[PDB]
Design an enzyme around this catalytic site. Structure first.
Site, PDB file in Angstrom:
ATOM      1  N   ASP A 144      -2.763  -2.918  -3.951  1.00 45.95           N
ATOM      2  CA  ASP A 144      -4.116  -2.419  -4.173  1.00 45.95           C
ATOM      3  C   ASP A 144      -4.122  -1.152  -5.012  1.00 45.95           C
ATOM      4  OD1 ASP A 144      -7.018  -2.667  -3.535  1.00 45.95           O
ATOM      5  OD2 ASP A 144      -6.666  -0.690  -2.646  1.00 45.95           O
ATOM      6  N   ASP A 145      -3.082  -0.324  -4.889  1.00 45.12           N
ATOM      7  CA  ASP A 145      -3.020   0.920  -5.650  1.00 45.12           C
ATOM      8  C   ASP A 145      -2.954   0.664  -7.150  1.00 45.12           C
ATOM      9  OD1 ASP A 145      -2.905   2.623  -3.264  1.00 45.12           O
ATOM     10  OD2 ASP A 145      -0.903   1.774  -2.977  1.00 45.12           O
ATOM     11  N   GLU A 153       0.840  -1.187   0.000  1.00 49.93           N
ATOM     12  CA  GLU A 153       0.000   0.000   0.000  1.00 49.93           C
ATOM     13  C   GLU A 153       0.877   1.239   0.000  1.00 49.93           C
ATOM     14  OE1 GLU A 153      -3.235  -0.212  -0.197  1.00 49.93           O
ATOM     15  OE2 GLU A 153      -4.059   1.730   0.397  1.00 49.93           O
TER      16      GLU A 153
END
Lengths: 565, 565, 565
Positions: free
Chosen positions: C258-259, C235
């Site tokens: 996730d980015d 993250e």
């Protein structure tokens, strides 16, 4: 762990082998006499008291007291001469000692679970202080090998079996849990014994019994994981097969009496083929006995024959089995599911001697514990039918062997190929021929299989694993040993044998996509070696380190340097 | 405590005496076999193995294994027949077993502190897991009674002594700590023993030794409080007196070899006065021996004479003492500080026989462990000088007694009043006279004194406490026992005797403003009884309770009743 | 052993505060530590919410929620799940970064592990500081690229803490099995480097092989201790590092970023939902990307995968994508390209501005992620509305102040025909003519909770991009036909728990179909399986598992002196 409790921890307690520096760091200095011994010296000291004991029973007692207090030193003793101590901590001494003395453990060794605990087994598992359990050995004590129904005194058997897991194979003992399931006992001497400490009623049976076993398997794998190995030991005939067939494809489970004996017997047959110099397909087998061991061996023999290209139905017909009622034949009375699989199309035959004459087998395998069943006539017949007959008197103890090694070699005029379940000394015939008969010990098999299963998270144990284990054992035998009549490798090499088995089993599992552990190790030998437990004491290092001087200076903030730029 | 560790806790472990409900509440169900025994049955079971042992040494071993695992059951055994087990867990067996086997404890029983730990004793005390210690028994192993220098093997002695604290007096065993101070050993057999586990150098002596003892007393009272009782056991002659005089007014301290023996010997003399029917001031004492016990007895005798109105200097002159060089006389060679106090104005006399003839004592007390020192001539002389001569052959063991009971009664024609340190059976002379000689056991004294000291926080122990303890013991003897020649009460009543002593000691302390515990109890018997440890298992009750229904309803707040008025 | 005593009041997972009943307080041995009132969780929620609503800013609301999470985890998640759309912006983006930038780290209970570059070689030791042994999910950051804020260094620990709160509140992932980690290698934030109160490493960011070696050791140590199945989510790493670490670890560990991948999946989910409005196929579209960073590359690669699934050849699919970086259109032969940008280079003359790219390419969809405020000019929007009936306008850049355009500007300039989505929440829009729209928000919380839930439930070993595509397809189907007519492309956040469950099931179905899931046996009912793992804010029980044996059986097993024989 630290403080006083480390001296009460069997896995960490070193006793006087704690150095002064170790005692100070653990906060125990003063609890131990002011002498610092090496483990070699500790072994010297305990062996003096061991040799003073007058019987094997008393030697087992001394060893259990040592296991109670110092696990590393206990395995230093066992591994110092594994062949000497295996019959003391396990068969035949362990059952005799527990029968006579009861349970002598003064530190809890595992879990006693009763039929009356049904519905609460999950809670009982939480009494065990180790959360990382990877192998369970369980018994109900109904069929202790060579002794029968010992009830709750059967707890000694899983405890002794697990000692061979660690001593012969190197399985981590801290990850091991012995369990006694007490559903009662049908031993009348125990039921009437004022000192007996098990359930004093006859054995619960039927589906109520099976429901307890179902909840046991569920609770163990719920807590420790579905990968946890659960080995069944010394169950009765019918229960052993039903439970094996019920669980072997649902859990990580095997039964050593059925499948371990099978592997070691087939290993002996495979090694004898190096002497007879013929194919397995050319053999005809007569079994003296039809219980757990006999069926396991016959089933694994069929699988070995299929490997050589013999179809199953044809392979099965090479096997003739004799129980206490006679030859197992089609349409005979007193048969069960397992016996019908090997029932031959032949009229009834009452005696083993007549079966030998009708069948003329190349190999006879006895596991029925009927002393002298391999009569002089049987040995003479076999030596007349074939050049090198195979004679496996595998029953225990020595007093129940089908024949002695000396009788086999003498009557067959030195041509019979012999193995036994009991240790027989070397035999020298009158004409000078010398033989060194091997012992078909189950410890050749289950330590390495368990080590490979545990190392790889092998989800289930198909019989192909026991067949490849047999093949590995048969090739451990050197050409010189074969010329001496030895069908098994020396027990003094059991740790090396178990390691090579564990590697072969682990390799088989990855190729068959049966191993749960990932990533697959590239060097399986190094991987398994890293999991092998040694009797060497570990070291309580502190893992102290510092940061670089410039880092520590900038990260340490005081009123003087608070506003530095 | 709860969980698996309770089974490893000697103070709480009940083994199979845990009820099912108790096992479930403690979270240990499954660790114990499925049988629920009473402690009576547990005692039955362990006594079967106890009686199978072939020697007293092996019986001591069995008992130590039991103490290792179940303290309550251990004291149930001891208190079942205290006279039978006292010589096994303590003198003479404990020293013989430790000499032969070493230290057999498989659970740490106390602290080994060496001269090389000087400056760090405070840290070592933190290794002991019990913080509430109220009594310490310490030795350096130099003068084990009857055996000599056992070095670090002397740790068995404080362990056995503390068992008599609890079994005979009822002192809480969990509040007790045995300590071995290892400064070396001068026993050449130990120094050359490959298996000896103590410091393998000669004993450190002089002020370096005294500095270690100073730091020990400081560290113990720093951690456990200045009220903590510290009892010295089996120190050498010179050290014992120097340490007693140095500490007895600074700490809560006594030496049982000096002061306990004194009390039990004087108790016998006081009881004999009920037979001789004369005053203590009419007696003349000859001592065979001049060590710790002899000096303690002589000092307490002087105090008893002062109580009757005899001035000290005059009281001292009633005491004649003979060491290995002869009568202790003024200006003699080979005297020390204690011996000069009793040096008589008389020319040198070499033998005890001549001293008896010159002094014509009413009482002779032997503690020198010279067998047969009370010769037939001595017994004959005493019986001719006085109607009822007092003959105390107090030396241990039986083989070192100054005379036997039978020889005393026969030679004095049934008129000698006899007591010994060793147990002698009843004696019946040829004319029909029967005697039951008593044993001057130190266990009559130290259990009750320790119980009263601990109960009241008695800051220091003046010798008046040992004198009143002697007076209490002498009045325990019944008139019928006196007519049988018994000078001491039955050992089977030792717990009742110790309780009455503890009460008298506690009463003395409050009247002299020596007790630290407040408020002063009005009922001292009830107070002391509440501190007496019983072998009965305790109970893990949960102390569950509820609030009144109206309280629980108003104090339970939900979204439904949040705004009720 | 279940946790008890005073420490349970400090255990955030078990502490209930005044919701402990009297029975529970007495059972746990904590009665007296808590005020004498027994509250329901509903009442606790009401009490904390009154203090919450009194706070004057989002930052203060964040602090209040953090002190609550410090002390009572169940009540914390009761608050969060009572209105997840309300509290998501408070415990995570955008408030968490602003709060940590302003106040630092306000946690007063340790929430995770700070691991620095200076700890290289000792990360395994540091993992042992975390008191939870059973970790199944790790969120890690180096704080270099906090979304919407930049380099926060060691204050970035707040981001994994807040992210994991959304794992549990949005998805139902067990919070006790979650571990946030801050990797401190320095910071390039000049304000933090000159701040005397900054508590991170006070030097610029370490880069190069030492940085990569630390990350390698982190992945090895986490999986060595917690298992290779442990989910590790990266993250707020810098863009170059994020892509490089993802490619290095995604096939070796259970890992995703996730980015990159979560943003890709939610953006593609919005495009697929827009297809339900435009009523054409993905192959009919032409995409122009404002920004050529790695988040744009993530979206572009997932679009190509979705196009291939429709049957478009990969080269044809890639040519539907036009990307614009800071230098202009990415074309063949242009300077200032890189390895990833050359994959999307078009055979086209150089174009300097996004406005000219839009006019020459006439895209059906424009996607902005370059964080350039106002990049979607009126001319761009007017052109899109004239080229196509329903152009897709995705202004996904964060924060709100750097969005490509507002929802109002899109709807106004496109005459109400543009299909709009943003990364920031825009309120409802009503144009001057009365047309009303409800723009949706492309929130990453639509994706990672359900993906994580399914990955953890199934032991999915690696997370291929097919999982993010099927997750996007699931989300696109969640939107109702009515909501699509209002311009909403995403389902209501109030349903996130149900959406996450349906995603977890679809992911699980896919994993077992392709042999990616390691949990066995495969559950027959995937929905019931996942539901059994979902964490609820309901307080757990402390019901003791007590029971009895049958009365007759217990009587026979209860042995007394009376019934022994």
């Amino acid at each position: 762990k630290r403080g006083y409790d480390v001296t009460r921890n069997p896995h960490l307690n070193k006793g006087m082998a704690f150095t002064l520096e170790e005692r100070l760091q653990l906060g125990i200095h003063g609890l131990i006499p002011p002498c610092f011994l090496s483990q070699d010296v500790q072994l010297l000291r305990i062996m003096r008291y061991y040799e003073r004991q007058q019987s094997d029973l008393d030697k087992y007692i001394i060893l259990m007291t040592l296991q109670d207090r110092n696990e590393k030193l206990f395995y230093r003793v066992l591994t110092s001469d594994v062949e000497k101590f295996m019959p003391i901590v396990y068969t035949p001494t362990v059952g005799l000692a527990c029968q006579h003395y009861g349970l002598t453990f003064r530190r809890p060794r595992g879990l006693f679970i009763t039929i009356h605990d049904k519905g609460h087994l999950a809670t009982m598992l939480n009494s065990w202080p180790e959360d990382n359990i990877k192998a369970v050995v369980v018994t109900d004590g109904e069929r202790i090998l060579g002794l029968g129904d010992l009830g709750c005194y059967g707890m000694g058997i899983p405890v002794g079996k697990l000692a061979l897991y660690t001593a012969c194979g190197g399985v981590n003992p801290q990850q091991c849990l012995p369990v006694l399931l007490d559903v009662g006992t049908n031993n009348e001497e125990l039921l009437r014994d004022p000192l007996y400490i098990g359930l004093k009623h006859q054995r619960v049976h039927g589906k109520a019994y099976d429901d307890l076993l179902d909840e046991f398997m569920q609770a163990v794998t719920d807590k420790f994981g579905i990968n946890c190995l659960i080995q069944f030991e010394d169950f009765a005939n019918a229960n052993a097969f039903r439970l094996l067939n019920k669980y072997r494809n649902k859990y990580c489970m095997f039964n050593d009496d059925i499948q371990g004996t099978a592997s070691v017997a087939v290993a002996g047959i495979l090694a004898a083929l190096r002497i007879t110099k013929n194919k397995l397909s050319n053999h005809v087998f007569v079994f003296q006995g039809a219980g757990e061991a006999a069926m396991g061996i016959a089933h694994l023999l069929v699988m070995a024959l299929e490997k050589e290209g013999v179809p199953k139905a044809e392979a099965t017909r090479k096997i003739w089995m004799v129980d206490s009622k006679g030859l197992i034949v089609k349409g005979r009375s007193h048969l069960n599911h397992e016996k019908e699989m090997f029932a031959q199309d032949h009229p009834e035959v009452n005696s083993l001697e007549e079966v030998v004459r009708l069948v003329k087998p190349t190999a006879i395998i006895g596991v029925a514990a009927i002393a002298g069943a391999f009569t002089e006539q049987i040995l003479r017949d076999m030596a007349s039918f074939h050049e090198r007959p195979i004679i496996f008197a595998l029953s225990n103890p020595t007093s129940k062997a089908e024949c002695t090694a000396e009788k086999c070699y003498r009557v067959t005029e030195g041509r019979g190929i012999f193995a036994s379940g009991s240790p027989f000394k070397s035999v020298t015939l009158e004409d000078g021929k010398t033989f060194i008969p091997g012992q078909g010990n189950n410890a050749y098999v289950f330590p390495g299989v368990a080590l490979g299963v545990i190392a790889g998270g092998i989800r289930h144990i198909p019989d192909e694993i026991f067949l490849l284990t047999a093949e590995q054992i048969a090739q451990e035998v050197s050409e010189q040993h074969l010329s001496q009549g030895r069908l098994y490798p020396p027990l003094s090499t059991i740790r090396d044998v178990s390691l090579r088995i564990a590697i072969k089993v682990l390799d088989y599992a990855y190729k068959h996509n049966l191993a749960s552990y990932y990533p697959e190790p590239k060097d399986k030998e190094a991987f398994v070696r890293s999991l092998v437990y040694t009797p060497d004491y570990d070291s309580f290092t502190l893992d102290s380190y510092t940061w670089p001087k410039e880092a520590m200076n900038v990260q340490t903030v005081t009123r003087e340097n608070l506003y530095f730029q």
